[PDB]
């Protein structure tokens, strides 16, 4: 009963702002360059985080996720957030 975020929930926030695609080659993991792939610097999940804290409830974190290079990282990160606040 315990869930608050999981692997395959980051993964949907990050398809979310791709739009349409039956593609993708997971054939191992995808959380390693998840975010250095296509160009994710900051700016570009910079506003899909914003939307995304407000739907999950979670605090507003600019410094950390403003320069988030690792993705299992943002998984961590919301979801740690989340923790402590329950």
Same mark, same amino acid.
């Given at each position: $009963?315990? !869930?608050?975020?999981?692997?395959?929930?980051?993964?949907?926030?990050?398809?979310?702002?791709?739009? *349409?695609?039956?593609? @993708? #080659?997971?054939?191992? #993991?995808?959380?390693?360059?998840?975010? *250095? #792939?296509?160009?994710?610097?900051?700016?570009?999940? $910079?506003? !899909?985080?914003?939307?995304?804290?407000?739907?999950?409830?979670?605090?507003?974190?600019?410094?950390?996720?403003?320069?988030?290079? @690792?993705?299992?990282?943002?998984? #961590?990160?919301?979801?740690?957030?989340?923790?402590?606040?329950?």
């Amino acid at each position: $009963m315990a !869930t608050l975020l999981t692997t395959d929930d980051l993964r949907r926030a990050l398809v979310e702002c791709a739009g *349409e695609t039956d593609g @993708t #080659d997971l054939s191992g #993991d995808f959380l390693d360059l998840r975010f *250095e #792939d296509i160009g994710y610097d900051s700016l570009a999940l $910079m506003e !899909t985080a914003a939307r995304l804290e407000s739907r999950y409830g979670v605090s507003i974190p600019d410094d950390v996720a403003g320069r988030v290079d @690792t993705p299992r990282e943002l998984l #961590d990160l919301i979801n740690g957030a989340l923790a402590e606040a329950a």
